[PDB]
Amino acid sequence: TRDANGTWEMESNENFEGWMKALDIDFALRKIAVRLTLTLVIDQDGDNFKVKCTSTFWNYDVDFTVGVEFDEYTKSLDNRHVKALVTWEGDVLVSVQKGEKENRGWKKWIEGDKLYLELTCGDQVCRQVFKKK
Numbered sequence: 001t002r003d004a005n006g007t008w009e010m011e012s013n014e015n016f017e018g019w020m021k022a023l024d025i026d027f028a029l030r031k032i033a034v035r036l037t038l039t040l041v042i043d044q045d046g047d048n049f050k051v052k053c054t055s056t057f058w059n060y061d062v063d064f065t066v067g068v069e070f071d072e073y074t075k076s077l078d079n080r081h082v083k084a085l086v087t088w089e090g091d092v093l094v095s096v097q098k099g100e101k102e103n104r105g106w107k108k109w110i111e112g113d114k115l116y117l118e119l120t121c122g123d124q125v126c127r128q129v130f131k132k133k
């Protein structure tokens with residue numbers, strides 16, 4: 001349950017608006033983003049990950065190495081500098097993004113066919129579920 005490789009199609013997405021609002025995403029943009037279908041493509045090779053999140057109007061790409069802190073500029077999101085770090089906690093993949101926002105990051109649980117993703121910012125959690133295509 002440590003293998004996140006694949007093309008992942010969205011099944012559910014709860015509190016997406018609250019999480020985007022916690023990041024200060026423009027209100028008008030949030031209402032469009034709530035309509036867009038999101039696809040998550042992950043390439044995982046040892047510690048090296050390439051993550052690509054795509055919609056009609058929006059893309060979010062990030063590459064990282066597990067265990068290696070990296071400077072991140074969330075240019076397509078809230079446009080902030082964070083110090084990001086992705087590590088394993090048992091079978092959970094955990095990202096912490098140190099910076100202005102508290103409790104910022106995500107956690108991924110892979111259970112065979114399904115990927116559970118919890119994105120956090122401040123007091124908000126967005127819960128997403130994907131199924132491998």
Ligand SMILES: *C/C=C/c1ccc2c(c1)C(C)(C)c1cc(N(CC)CC)ccc1-2
Pocket residue numbers: 020033038039040051053054055058059060077106108117119128
């Ligand atoms: C393990 C996957 C982590 C991860 C990081 C960043 C994002 C995501 C998943 C998505 C797919 C939830 C996502 C969507 C968005 N947009 C909404 C504002 C759409 C492209 C941004 C960042 C991430």
